[PDB]
Structure formats: C-alpha cells, structure tokens
Design an enzyme around this catalytic site. Structure first.
Site, PDB file in Angstrom:
ATOM      1  N   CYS A 198      -1.373   3.995   5.216  1.00 45.68           N
ATOM      2  CA  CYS A 198      -1.161   4.677   3.933  1.00 45.68           C
ATOM      3  C   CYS A 198      -2.446   5.303   3.398  1.00 45.68           C
ATOM      4  O   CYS A 198      -2.442   6.459   2.963  1.00 45.68           O
ATOM      5  CB  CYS A 198      -0.571   3.713   2.896  1.00 45.68           C
ATOM      6  SG  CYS A 198      -1.486   2.172   2.710  1.00 45.68           S
ATOM      7  N   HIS A 238      -1.058  -1.140  -1.094  1.00 47.17           N
ATOM      8  CA  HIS A 238      -0.500   0.174  -0.803  1.00 47.17           C
ATOM      9  C   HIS A 238      -1.253   1.247  -1.581  1.00 47.17           C
ATOM     10  O   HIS A 238      -1.739   0.996  -2.684  1.00 47.17           O
ATOM     11  CB  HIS A 238       0.995   0.216  -1.150  1.00 47.17           C
ATOM     12  CG  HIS A 238       1.701   1.430  -0.632  1.00 47.17           C
ATOM     13  ND1 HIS A 238       1.810   1.703   0.711  1.00 47.17           N
ATOM     14  CD2 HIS A 238       2.349   2.432  -1.276  1.00 47.17           C
ATOM     15  CE1 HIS A 238       2.482   2.829   0.876  1.00 47.17           C
ATOM     16  NE2 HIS A 238       2.827   3.287  -0.315  1.00 47.17           N
ATOM     17  N   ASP A 268       4.077   9.536  -1.725  1.00 52.24           N
ATOM     18  CA  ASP A 268       4.036   8.223  -1.114  1.00 52.24           C
ATOM     19  C   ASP A 268       4.236   8.385   0.388  1.00 52.24           C
ATOM     20  O   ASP A 268       5.285   8.879   0.836  1.00 52.24           O
ATOM     21  CB  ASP A 268       5.110   7.340  -1.763  1.00 52.24           C
ATOM     22  CG  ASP A 268       4.985   5.876  -1.395  1.00 52.24           C
ATOM     23  OD1 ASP A 268       4.503   5.557  -0.284  1.00 52.24           O
ATOM     24  OD2 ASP A 268       5.436   5.037  -2.204  1.00 52.24           O
TER      25      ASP A 268
END
Ligand code: NA
Ligand code: NA
Ligand SMILES: [Zn+2]
Lengths: 365, 75
Positions: free
Chosen positions: A144, A278, A299
C-alpha cells in the site's frame, strides 16, 4: 471457585473487579487451555515479523508469479493472459518501471463530474490530477505505501519542475518522462537514500533492507524518497483525536486549507495518508450543503474494476461512496500526512533534510 | 526486576523495571537507553498494544518478559 483462570488455574473470585480478572486471563494470549514463556515470545515475534514483512521473506516478482499461477489454476486467468502479464512484467521491471497493469487513469475529471452534480455537494476541491494504482498479484497485502507513492509521483510528473527532479531517479536511463517507478525500483531508491545518510533512524528500524522484500513502509519512507530526489515535503502528525467520539476535525480542517490552494489553477498534488497498518491517498475534499467536510480518499486496496465505475455508463452517484470519508469514518487514533510543498534548492538544505522532522497537531512540543 | 525489549530486527535491550512502573515510564527508560522518542514507540506484549497509563502489573508482565517494540506508523 465459581470461575478460575482456564490457563493457570488461579482463583479469580478474589479479583478486585471483573476488568482486572479478565485482564489477567487475557495476559496468557494466545493460550486458552492449561499449557516456556520464551516460546510465546518467539511465536509473537514471528507473527509480528510476518505482518510487517520484517523477515525479508518473499518479493514482488515471486509473489506475482505465485499468485498469477494460483489464478490460472482457479480458472480466473487464462494461460494466454498469464503469458502476456508475465512478459509485460519482465519488460517493465527490466527498466524499473511499473507495468501499468493496475492503473486507472484520469481520476480527477471522473470524480469531479460525479461530485459536482451530487445533490448535497456545494464545493469539490481536488488535486490537479492523479492516477489510481491498485495493489495487484505481486503486492496485495503489503504494497500500500508504495502504491500511494506511485499515485503521488504520477501527479508530480505532470509538473515540469517536479518532473525535472524526479527524472533523476533513472540515473542514466532515458525512459518516457511520464514513467512511474516500479515497487522494486522504489525499494532500491529508498535503500540508496538510506546509504547516503537519509533517515538513519528509520533505516535501522527496517533492518537497513528493502529491495526484494515485502516489507511495510510508512510516511517517513515517502519523505526519505522525495527528499533524496530534492523534493521538499512536510510530514504532519495528527497524533491523537481532536473532536468528539475519537474524530479528527483538525485533520479535515488541515486538508481543506491545503486544497483551497487548488482553485487558483496552480498545481496541487494529492496527499499521502498513513494510519496504523494501511496507507491511502487523499485526492480532494468536498464541502456538503450543511458545511460538513468529506474527504475523497483513494485506496490501493480498491480494485481497477471498482475504480472503473467512475467512468461507467451508470455506477456514479452512489459509487462515489467508495472514496468518501466523513469525520465519523476516520477514527484511527493517529494519522500522518505527507504533503509535497516545493523543492530542495541547496546542498545545505539537502544535507539537513537527512534528519526527518515532523509537525505535530495539536502542538505538544 | 529485569525485562527485555526487542524490536522487529531482533535488537534486544534489557531494562530494570518494577511491576508498578507505568508503560509511559518504560518508554521513557527506552528513550534514556536507546534515544528512541516515546511517541515513535509501540510496545506489544501478548497481542496487546500496551497503554501508557497502565502498569506492568496490570498486564501481568513478570521478570524476564519480552516486550516487542514496533517503531513509527507503517502499514
Ligand atoms: Na525477500
Ligand atoms: Na466511504
Ligand atoms: Zn492465569
């Protein structure tokens, strides 16, 4: 004994209250039956290392091959597709360039079209441009931070000043000027930054190793990378909630003021957004008709198919819920934002940027 | 009494502590010994992130326990 500890058999009837009794029991985690303590330490050590990828185990290319093959055997990917994706990957990785397989283009005009016609929206304040990079076969579960770096770089590259600085990462090779580095290349550049003295504290925290790993990174590695490339960042640490019910009104106020510099037409890149476990990319903010602020948050855990909905013949008004985050939806205890604010214009400032500095909100320093 | 604090690289240090010490106190001892700012420290034991206001006794942390030290905000 009406209730005793199911692991050690201690009489819990004489505990000061129920919280302290439960807290004693939970101290045996993960043991739930009568079961050295150095063994539990090892198990926890291994589980934390696997979670953060701090064991250096595996890498992007290997995970890609494994997960693409699993998809083939699952009936999800044809053998032909396996060969095209594998070839594209090898070709792009040979140049240190992302293979573009997980990108969704033109996010800003697509979001703006839907947001500005949404009934409760009065203002839509966006970064100038951004492409979405989804995690894919090789990086799902751990990529991520790098994907968000890719999203920010995709925006910065459209600005000739920032492009001039970033393009130095190619170190001699001459790819298209819009080329975004792959995850493996990003890992390499961070190692190079560390070896020249950038963020020694952080490199030590990560075992001085990033290439050919699946290791979690955070906002400080973003700053390290961009500072290495002579791009000036600010790291803002929203270290505790500032509103009722654990909310972060001061983060929303900060983002609003950030994007209010976008209406002049001058270039405004998106924001890197970290919380525990995250990272994401703030691409803009909406002001709704009651005055409430709604973040627009890209995202990398969202798929290209999910992001394809914004360009669809239908899937628009309610599909925007995917990007929207109100104050009630942002209840992590802590957030960190990295904003790009300019360029590092001297060797003195370059050397000084090797010691990372952050801004705390609320101010407690 | 002695406990150990181990980062995810395996770097292990030993601390002199008491059961009534708060987690905040332990992070201060880590800063004194290794120069790590307490705001960067996430102490983990038995699957919990230890809260600054509670004590080692609250978490049943005995002699020779190992706390795992995660640093900064990553994901
Ligand atoms: Na590896
Ligand atoms: Na949402
Ligand atoms: Zn027990």
């Amino acid at each position: 004994p009406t209730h005793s500890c199911p692991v050690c058999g201690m009489n819990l009837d004489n505990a000061s209250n129920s919280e302290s009794a439960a807290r004693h029991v939970e101290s045996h985690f993960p043991a739930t039956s009568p079961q050295a303590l150095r063994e539990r330490e090892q198990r926890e050590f291994e589980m934390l290392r696997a979670q953060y990828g701090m064991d250096n185990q595996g890498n992007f290319r290997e995970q890609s091959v494994t997960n693409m093959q699993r998809a083939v055997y699952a009936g999800e990917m044809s053998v032909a597709d396996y060969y095209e994706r594998t070839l594209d990957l090898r070709a792009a990785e040979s140049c240190g360039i992302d293979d573009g397989s997980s990108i969704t283009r033109s996010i800003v005009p697509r979001v703006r079209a839907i947001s500005t016609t949404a009934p409760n929206v009065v203002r839509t304040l966006l970064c100038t441009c951004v492409d979405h990079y989804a995690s894919s076969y090789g990086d799902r579960g751990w990529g991520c931070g790098y994907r968000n770096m890719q999203m920010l770089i995709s925006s910065l590259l459209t600005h000739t000043g920032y492009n001039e600085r970033l393009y130095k990462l190619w170190q001699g090779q001459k790819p298209p000027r819009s080329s975004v580095p792959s995850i493996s290349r990003l890992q390499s550049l961070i190692e190079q930054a560390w070896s020249q003295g950038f963020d020694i504290q952080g490199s030590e925290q990560l075992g001085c190793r990033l290439v050919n790993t699946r290791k979690w990174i955070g906002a400080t590695e973003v700053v390290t990378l961009l500072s290495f490339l002579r791009i000036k960042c600010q790291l803002v640490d929203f270290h505790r909630p500032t509103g009722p019910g654990g909310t972060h009104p001061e983060l929303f106020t900060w983002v609003l003021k950030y994007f209010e510099n976008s209406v002049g037409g001058e270039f405004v890149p998106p924001l890197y957004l970290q919380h525990q476990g995250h990272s994401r990319t703030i691409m803009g903010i909406e002001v709704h008709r009651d005055g409430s602020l709604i973040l627009l948050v890209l995202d990398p855990s969202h798929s290209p198919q999910q992001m394809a909905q914004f360009g669809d013949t239908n899937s628009s008004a309610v599909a925007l819920r995917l990007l929207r985050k109100s104050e009630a939806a942002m209840k992590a205890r802590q957030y960190q934002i990295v904003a790009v604010v300019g360029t590092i214009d001297s060797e003195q400032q370059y050397q000084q940027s090797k010691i990372l500095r952050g801004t705390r909100i609320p101010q407690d320093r | 009494m002695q406990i150990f604090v181990k980062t995810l690289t395996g770097k292990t240090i030993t601390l002199e502590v008491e059961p009534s010490d708060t987690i905040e106190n332990v992070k201060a001892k880590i800063q004194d010994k290794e120069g790590i700012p307490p705001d960067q420290q996430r102490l983990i034991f038995a699957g919990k992130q230890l809260e600054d206001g509670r004590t080692l006794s609250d978490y049943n942390i005995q002699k020779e326990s190992t706390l795992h030290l995660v640093l900064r905000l990553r994901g």
